[PDB]
Design brief:
The complex is a heterodecamer, with two copies of chain A, two copies of chain B, two copies of chain C, two copies of chain D and two copies of chain E.
Chain A lengths: L4
Chain B lengths: L7 H18 L6 E2 L3 E6 L2 H5 L7 E5 L8 E7 L5 E8 L10 H6 E5 L7 E3 L1 H8 L6 E8 L5 E11 L8 E2 L2 E4 L42 H5 L50 E8 L5
Parallel strand pairs in B: 2-3
Antiparallel strand pairs in B: 3-4, 4-5, 5-7, 5-12, 6-7, 8-9, 8-12, 9-10, 9-11
Chain E lengths: L5
The complex binds a molecule of 2 linked components (NAG-NAG), 2-acetamido-2-deoxy-beta-D-glucopyranose (2 copies) and calcium ion (CA) (8 copies).
Subunit structure (chain G): Heterohexamer; disulfide linked. Contains 2 sets of 3 non-identical chains (alpha, beta and gamma). The 2 heterotrimers are in head to head conformation with the N-termini in a small central domain.
GO molecular function, one term (chain G): extracellular matrix structural constituent
Protein name (chain G): Fibrinogen beta chain
């Protein structure tokens, strides 16, 4: 998904 | 008994030589291979359809700038449309954790029944989509573990040359009940989430060729070959998860790596079936 | 003087059984299946053992 | 006493009931053909070497197109044996295929390239076959090509014959063979002939430089006017026969290995032989021929 | 095999 | 006796008495002449829309000043619209032509907007960042950005970018575009290989950079790019395209004329040397489907 | 012994003949101007990118320079032009009325005062924008609406022809709508001019002073009489006699919209109706001095 | 015989009024013209002469106060 | 100014 | 430009  | 048998069975032997000669003639052909390739050829599957082909299966196509003809699976509907399928998922049969050259040259198998998973080469996709003036359209077809399916079309689909790491670009999302995941998704952690998860204009990346927007390696981590951007909202080349539902506890790195399309299903939901195919745009109205 | 015929019709059979065995196996790759079978060369030799001692 | 020349007859006559029954049965099975379902691997190239360099790691049936002029064809790639990249040209392992064939068949090629692996959806098992003299010639001439020949006895033991150089001329040149740079454990049967034979007896079984011959096309070095005295006719299938051979990879597949003259259709050593390793009366359990680009 | 003269 | 003169004056007395009455009427008329204010040459057009294309689609003909109100916009605002003869309506958000306006502004000013809007399009300005955000992301329809440059020799060039959009102030107005769509000015937002460090091109690309001003640092530098180069822009340690930089007359300038030694002019590396400041500059957007 | 000085008392001749000569000059000037008025003055006020409800909000948005801006006090009212003074005491000032050269006539009717009139701004030398304020009256409708959006303060400034200046601050300022005749209201005074609007003329005593008090008065134009001068004689109305539109009582202590007398000093035989009709602020210089500069600015108060 | 001064003394009574009326008009026109600057493309540069009016109207009262 | 009563 |  995304990379916090 | 004297010679009344040194003849009876000396005659049998002449008929045996005869039937045996008959057997010989019936054992000269190879086993029958159920997978056959069709004769029609063209620049793409639409071109082949335009040439009267009637069924979906394996055909050789040879784009304009291609120096060698290659085999592809064509999907021909009764409507006279010819889709060139370049990606497929349906069971966890083929491993998609491949390297640059493998995603470039292609992997998996091609069937006439279209019941096999695969990844047509990146180079092949590039040669088809950019082969000429005419623009193409990409249709992403998904299916959950409940028999429900959805789609999403992208106009002016094109993949760049390897010199530009096979960058993906499209003019605009053309609609589809699956939603535009290539536009990114608002996961809610940081306002920049939707941006860093958009795919339009992204370069391709595998674990051994990092061209993403992440300081780390998205393809290495999520274990695939795909157009990463720190990292994704659409991951059709991700790990095949049986059941659909999965958690970060079952992932090797804690991040979602399944076959997701965030605008249709949660990221922790891997798709059951997946299809990526293109067709000249004018073919859609 | 039939001995010159068995020193033939026996060996001929020895060549034929073998031929058919090979011929039949060669269909394993053309037809639905090949008859599983075995060739008894021994009995043929032992048949030519006494035919030889005599 | 000396009436036992009777039991031999009722015996033969009985043997015949056996045989007829068996042949008739095979005849039955042949009403329906064997079939395979080889889904084609996506990756492709000019040969197996290029294919393994493109990621094709597994040993199976691939598609190759040696030249833009020739139609892409199916061949079995051996991506395991000594670094992979091997293109199987000929293969023997079970006698499932008939090699005693004419010129056209050896020209075009014949047999089964591969068959299905248990449940899998692809043919990861090679079958018995001969690629075809035309295809083979062209492959060898694209550039420096090496040749690896492997065999194994009905006891598990195996040896090999390597030829760093290998060449087959076109049909016009009667597919004249040429090999060099030998090394192995089988014995240089192709370039030296039978080690057991002496003087001109040995040299006349040399294969390097011979022309291809089938039983309907005599091009062997056995210059005779007698039509019955031709190497191919007498030794089984198509091969680069001299007068006649030291090796014969396409001979008759005798089950068990050991065979004799009264077993052979013509009383000659027409089996899957390699004299330099097991004499002329031993038919190998496995026999193969693979090619691959060399080094320069 | 060979073929003697 | 004597007064053949008393009539004389009585004449003049009555004379100019009537003269006075006539003159006051002539004055009343003047008064009607001087009631109107001076004619202000700058007028605002009546049509309105979500953007300039929308306005164009509504028959608007000439380029000038119009009010527009994007979907999420809570208040209408003025903008300069460029409408060609082909029915295309561009929304202009940045302009440079002479050094008239100071671009060394703060966060609030680059956010709200500064400079002036003219009907004749002969004026420098920076439509607010907020307005640019509201327009570019107002709806599904993607926008395209056109960067137009003019050197001091009368030559012009362009650089188009597709899927142009500006982030919310929440994400410091990040600049984002899908891909460079061509133009003879080159893709400077891709960074430029000035030679030095191999990370040159990487630290001088702009796509995906957050906006920065001397008082609101969001660049990829340890120092403050906007502070040094004196401008507001999407810095990245720092730039290869800097259209809000210092205006240098004649274009040619050096590190000896700059305050901190670095190139702070209006540059576009892929078209001219960083020591060549542009003469004119235009940043305008229009629905992407309008260029295809 | 009888006609000693009458042959001399014909001095009248020069007085009359002079006047007749004076009339010729006057007749000429009026025509010259009449002609000059065939073509109008013009401005090219390019509009500042930044906007807002009033000048306060605009300066809070980065509007540092004093010039003409475009504002929209409310979403229902059309954006209009106004001059923002962003330098005087913390800025954010929206000019309501301005005098500085007599370039504009203030003796107007009710409708003009209601709509507004004059030049908001003019161009500065080279510059492509209007940085100088012109002489004008924003408009009673606009002014009212501006003072009623919330607490509003009022700053009135003036300067004599000698350079000096004083001011009048009112922390509270309100103007009701037209239906309420734009009734004025002010409080919280402070400054150096003098509390003219709330206390009346300082030089006046008793009811005389009290009748020149402006706080609470209604707005009057020479064509609309709302002053506190209760009388049936049509000639006796403050607006008519003293010049312009204003919150006249009976009549004034301050007359920002009076006649622009040049030089400052004027007398009764100079004034049209013999009254103090100039730009007057009695509390600072009496009624016989017309200021050189006079202005009225407004700004949200504190909350 | 004396029917003279009553006319002269009344005329001078009228001139002073024309004089005061003129001063007002002089000033009224001086102010009306200037209000044209911010309306017309041009403004007539002029000048009022109050000293003169006040000198004559001053001189007049000297004559008016004879009989 | 003012107007006396 | 680039800031090294
Ligand atoms: C208010 O002013 C008036 C005059 O402006 C003063 O009242 C008298 O008014 C009459 C005419 O109405 C004059 O004849 C008188 O001369 C005025 N009185 C004087 C001498 O000033 C009145 O005095 C003033 N009010 C106060 C109490 O100061
Ligand atoms: C040359 C020579 O010595 N001949 C011998 C001979 O014993 C044998 O009969 C012959 C068969 O042709 O081959 C050799 O073994
Ligand atoms: C070759 O075979 C012949 C058969 O007659 C034999 O005599 C000879 O010894 C063999 N080789 C030689 C020439 O030694
Ligand atoms: Ca978010
Ligand atoms: Ca990376
Ligand atoms: Ca045969
Ligand atoms: Ca011959
Ligand atoms: Ca570099
Ligand atoms: Ca920094
Ligand atoms: Ca008037
Ligand atoms: Ca009244």
């Amino acid at each position: 998904g995304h990379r916090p | 008994y004297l010679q009344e048998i040194y003849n009876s069975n000396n005659q049998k032997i002449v008929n045996l030589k005869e039937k045996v000669a008959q057997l010989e003639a019936q054992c000269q052909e190879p086993c029958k291979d159920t997978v056959q390739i069709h004769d029609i050829t063209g620049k793409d599957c639409q071109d082949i359809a335009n040439k009267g082909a009637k069924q979906s299966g394996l055909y050789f196509i040879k784009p304009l700038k291609a120096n060698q003809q290659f085999l592809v699976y064509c999907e021909i509907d009764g409507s006279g449309n010819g889709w060139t399928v370049f990606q497929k998922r349906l069971d966890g049969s083929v491993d998609f954790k491949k390297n640059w050259i493998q995603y470039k040259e292609g992997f998996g198998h091609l069937s006439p029944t279209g019941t096999t998973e695969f990844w047509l080469g990146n180079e092949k996709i590039h040669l088809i989509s950019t082969q000429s003036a005419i623009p193409y359209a990409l249709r992403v077809e998904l299916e959950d573990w409940n028999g429900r399916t959805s789609t999403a079309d992208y106009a002016m689909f094109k993949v760049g040359p390897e010199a530009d790491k096979y960058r993906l670009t499209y003019a605009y999302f053309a609609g589809g009940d699956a939603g535009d995941a290539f536009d990114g998704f608002d996961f809610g952690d940081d306002p920049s989430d939707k941006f860093f998860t958009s795919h339009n204009g992204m370069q391709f990346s595998t674990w051994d060729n990092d061209n993403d927007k992440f300081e780390g390696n998205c393809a290495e981590q999520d274990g695939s070959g795909w157009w990463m951007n720190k990292c994704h909202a659409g991951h059709l080349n991700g790990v095949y998860y049986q059941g659909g539902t999965y958690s970060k506890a079952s992932t090797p790195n804690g991040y979602d790596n399944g076959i997701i399309w965030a605008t249709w299903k949660t990221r922790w939901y891997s798709m059951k079936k997946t299809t990526m195919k293109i067709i000249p745009f004018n073919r859609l109205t | 003087l039939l001995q010159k015929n068995v020193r033939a019709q026996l060996v001929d059979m020895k060549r034929l059984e073998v031929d058919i065995d090979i011929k039949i196996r060669s269909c394993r790759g053309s037809c639905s299946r090949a008859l599983a079978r075995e060739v008894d060369l021994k009995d043929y030799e032992d048949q030519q053992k006494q035919l030889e001692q005599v | 006493n000396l009436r036992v020349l009777r039991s031999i007859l009722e015996n033969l006559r009985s043997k015949i009931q056996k045989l007829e029954s068996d042949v008739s049965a095979q005849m039955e099975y042949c009403r329906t053909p064997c079939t395979v379902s080889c889904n084609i691997p996506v990756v492709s190239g000019k040969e197996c070497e290029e294919i393994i360099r493109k990621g094709g790691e597994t040993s199976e049936m691939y598609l190759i197109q040696p030249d833009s002029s020739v139609k892409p064809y199916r061949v079995y790639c051996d991506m395991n044996t000594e670094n992979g990249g091997w293109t199987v040209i000929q293969n023997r392992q079970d006698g499932s295929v008939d090699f005693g064939r004419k010129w056209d068949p050896y020209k075009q090629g014949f047999g089964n390239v591969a068959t299905n692996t248990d449940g899998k959806n692809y043919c990861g098992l090679p079958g018995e076959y001969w690629l075809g003299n035309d295809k083979i010639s062209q492959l060898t001439r694209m550039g420096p090509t090496e040749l690896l020949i492997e065999m194994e006895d009905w006891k598990g033991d195996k040896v090999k014959a390597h030829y760093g150089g290998f060449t087959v001329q076109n049909e016009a040149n009667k597919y004249q063979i040429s090999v060099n740079k030998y090394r192995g454990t089988a014995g240089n049967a192709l370039m030296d002939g039978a080690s057991q034979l002496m003087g001109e007896n040995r040299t006349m079984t040399i294969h390097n430089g011979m022309f291809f011959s089938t039983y309907d096309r005599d091009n062997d070095g056995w210059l005779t006017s007698d039509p019955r005295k031709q190497c191919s006719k007498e030794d089984g299938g198509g091969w680069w026969y001299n007068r006649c051979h030291a090796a014969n990879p396409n001979g008759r597949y005798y089950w068990g290995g050991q065979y004799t003259w009264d077993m052979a259709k013509h009383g000659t050593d027409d089996g899957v032989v390699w004299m330099n390793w097991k004499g002329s009366w031993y038919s190998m359990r496995k026999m193969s021929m693979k090619i691959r680009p060399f080094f320069p | 095999g060979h073929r003697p003269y």
